Amino acid sequence: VHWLFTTCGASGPHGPTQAQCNNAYQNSNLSVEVGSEGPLKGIQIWKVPATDTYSISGYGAAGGKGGKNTMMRSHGVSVLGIFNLEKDDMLYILVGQQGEDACPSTNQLIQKVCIGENNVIEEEIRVNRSVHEWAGGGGGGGGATYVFKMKDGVPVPLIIAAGGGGRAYGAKTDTFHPERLENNSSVLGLNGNSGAAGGGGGWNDNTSLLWAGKSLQEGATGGHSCPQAMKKWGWETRGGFGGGGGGCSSGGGGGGYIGGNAASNNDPEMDGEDGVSFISPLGILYTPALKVMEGHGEVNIKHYLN
């Protein structure tokens, strides 16, 4: 007996509708309520059937790829906890969505960049030393996966499994930074830093920049693409639902409890950072967090024996 929560077929910066999850879950014994407006839009609400110890395995989404798809993407993080839950408790489950890949594109000039038939960016890096005009090509951050409850009206996080940062346009490494896992509620769950690309959204912040991933309590919408990339040629690479940041040349930050930082400038080699994961101090971590998801996130819940 288990319950498997998916994106219900949704992708991109916005989460699924009620009808998408109803369709996705028609063959299983899983019923959820999905809000249609406000900060809870796209978050799946599930009723705990019995008082028991449960395992809640959360899996964040991967970040997007950069200016070539011949690079590894930053995989989303797994966080596996056990929790005491009471019958009829309501769990709020946001399944993170993959950060958008920069390529391929519908635009003629951006596709030529994608297959290496347009060297404007390389030329700008050569003649000039930075990318100020031909911005774009970095991937969006992946959304984190959030599992939380309500306590006297205030949201309380249980599991947050971080999203991967987007790859920069010019990324050429297959290595990543270690997983950060927080478990102290006193540590503020803030957005990551935004620069040209968007920082990842955290758990609870105030987001003003269109390209920044929104924090969970703001509704966790993935960030828009960076303004210069839109202004120059419409290169739209967005973050995934769950707080992913938009991509510029640099990659967007992954969502999390604390969002991943994007580079302060538009460095075409600077990946977005992965977000920071979280486990409630009242849960128990079953095994170390690992980066494992190449696409969208997911949540698996079951009765926990032992």
| Domains of the chain by residue range | 1-306
The Cα–Cα gap between 73 and 67 comes to: 12
Sign of the C-alpha dihedral computed for residues 295, 59, 37 and 189 taken in this order: negative
Residue in the block written with tokens 């009206």: 153
The Cα–Cα gap between 150 and 45 comes to: 11
First to last CA, the chain: 16
The two tokens of residue 28 are 């299983």
DSSP 8-state secondary structure symbol assigned to residue 38? G
Q: Helix, strand or coil for residue 146?
A: strand
CA gyration radius, the chain:
19
Which residues, listed in sequence order, are joined to residue 9 by a DSSP beta bridge? none
Nearest to 134 by CA among 144, 145, 143, 126: 126
The two tokens of residue 258 are 């604390």
Task: Report which secondary-structure segment, H or E, holds 94.
Answer: strand 90-94
* Resolution value (Å, 1 decimal): 1.9
Nearest to 81 by CA among 301, 294, 258: 301
Max CA distance (Å), the chain: 66
> CB neighbours of 287 closer than 8 A, spacing ≥ 6?
80
> CB neighbours of 104 closer than 8 A, spacing ≥ 6?
111, 114
Is the bond preceding residue 104 a cis peptide, omega within 30 degrees?
Answer: yes
- What is the DSSP secondary-structure string of 11-31? -SSS---HHHHHHHTTTTT--
Residue in the block written with tokens 């990659």: 251
239 with 223: CB under 8 angstroms? yes
Burial class, 28, CB count within 10 angstroms (exposed 0-12 / middle 13-18 / buried 19+): exposed
The two tokens of residue 19 are 């009808």
Centre a 10 Å sphere on the Cβ of residue 153 and count the other Cβ atoms it contains. 5
Centre a 10 Å sphere on the Cβ of residue 187 and count the other Cβ atoms it contains. 13
Residue in the block written with tokens 């987001």: 207
Task: Report which secondary-structure segment, H or E, holds 150.
Answer: strand 145-151
DSSP 8-state secondary structure symbol assigned to residue 262? P
84 with 75: CB under 8 angstroms? no
Task: Report which secondary-structure segment, H or E, holds 287.
Answer: strand 284-293
Burial class, 19, CB count within 10 angstroms (exposed 0-12 / middle 13-18 / buried 19+): exposed
CA angle 236, 41, 273 (to 5 degrees): 45
179 with 287: CB under 8 angstroms? no
105 with 115: CB under 8 angstroms? no
Nearest to 216 by CA among 258, 260, 261: 258
Counted residue by residue, the chain has a size of 306
Nearest to 235 by CA among 253, 252, 218, 219: 252
